[model samples]
Target chain A: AFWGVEVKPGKTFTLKNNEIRRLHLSQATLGHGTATNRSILQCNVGNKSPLLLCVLTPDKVDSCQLNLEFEETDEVIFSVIGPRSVHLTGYFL
Target chain B: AFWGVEVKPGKTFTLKNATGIRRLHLSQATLGHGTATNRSILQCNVGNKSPLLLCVLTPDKVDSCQLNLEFEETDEVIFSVIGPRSVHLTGYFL
Candidate 1:
């Protein structure tokens, strides 16, 4: 199945990690905004070091491609640290 | 299947439509190496329809962008880069 969601500034989104095998995160893009700051997408699993997925600025990096794979036991939390909003989409294989 | 290519300025890339690949998902576009400080826009043209703006990358502001492409139409499409430098694109099919 295909999944897409937006992570707003200061908002946190968690990925369901019980889908058997790995999940592929394919893309992310900055949403509509006039702010020129950078938007970051970070993944946190349990208390481990957060993985920085992608950083996109307004206008310039309006979009980005992310190829991430995670197993079922990994705890995953999607968080947007900056910018206005970042839209993410991918599929479960 | 996975497909990736660099679309340079003044060049057009045609997407291969076939049965083996179910969809051509465009994931991202980035500004390649160059000294051009202006913004470059990556666009896709399907038949005679209006060119769709995939992403815009500026040097100081935005240098790359990610896209979520759900290409349902099988029409032969052309990808073009507008501005001074080339744009690197990556995506996969399943």
Candidate 2:
């Protein structure tokens, strides 16, 4: 249960269900701009096929480290579209 | 128990001491067999700690890296790959 969140760029960053434990998507930081943007970390559980989990570029990679594995009732959404603020560190294994 | 290793570029990759499983999830990293253009730093020494700069790969803005590291299994680690080359480490183990 060691988590972190800063998904604030242009919209939706939702991930809150019910029956917990099984969330591990570990690290993706790009919080302050140097400009050169591109941070797309997406996921949609039940409908599927929107999982493009990793990509964060700003001075050529602000931060990245992910393996992606989640399920709390799954309906995840980490849709970032940014110039700054995109930090999602992970845990809950 | 699941582990992955491929740390090259004046190599010194050594960590092979297995028992049961205490859990080690390094998870992800990719930038191997390079067409190099800088940015590839995966360093973890782990003796008394303080040499851990796990991942940073930018060939064209983050080649690949996804990590949720949590090592244990005595954790006498050593992985080195500073710049201009290989680094592919996938991970698993509950």
Candidate 3:
């Protein structure tokens, strides 16, 4: 199964757990914007500080690949820092 | 099994023969330095058929995809990159 989500700054998107038990994140496509600062994407599990996934600079490449595998029990929360939104794509296993 | 290759424009990478049917799990693509505005493309050609689009990478970005392309032992695949920049591909086989 495939999964995709758009995460904006200050907003969060949690993986839907009813479909599967694990997700293998494969890609992150950054949206085009004029922000001079780079946007940082992070993954948060429970109360722990979010782990940095990738960074997107508007002046540079707009997409990247990821190798993040997480289980539903992790309560993964995708969050971003900066001005642009990020589109994440992956598959469920 | 793991497979990694760097394909430049006009060059190709051929997969070696193996015992079982192999499925390629393309995980990452890193584009080389260039100022070209066009996005770099990765293509796979099987026999005489037209090339299959694998991935499109823009400049300065590390791109990746989940392309579950399977191959038989007898199958011959020619992987190539199109653009001014070279592309580095890294993935594992299943």
**TM-score per model (chain B):** 0.88, 0.32, 0.74
**Model 2: how far residue A19 lies from native, Å:** 18
Q: Each model's C-alpha lDDT?
A: 0.74, 0.69, 0.69
- Report the C-alpha displacement of residue A69, candidate 2, in angstroms: 7.0
- Tell me how many clashing residue pairs each candidate has: 7, 4, 0
lDDT of 3 by residue, A1-93 (tens): 434566876789877566447777776766545677788898887879778999877646565667678876656788988898777766556
Candidate 1's residue-wise lDDT over A1-93, tens digit each? 444577889999877666375667777767656789898889888877888888987755567778776675766888998858777766556
- Per-residue lDDT of A8-64 in model 2, one digit per residue for the tens? 677667777674667676677665555686877676666667767777776666676
Q: Quickly count the clashes in candidate 1.
A: 7
CAPRI classification of candidate 2: incorrect
Clashing pairs in 1: A60-B62, A61-B62, A61-B64, A63-B65, A63-B66, A64-B65, A64-B66
lDDT of 3 by residue, B1-94 (tens): 8877888977888875647655666666677666786677676666665454555676644344444434443557778987888888887876
TM-score ranking from best to worst?
A: 1, 3, 2
The parts of candidate 1 lying over 4 Å away from their true place are A19-21, B1-94
lDDT tens per residue, model 1, B55-76: 6788867776667665545567
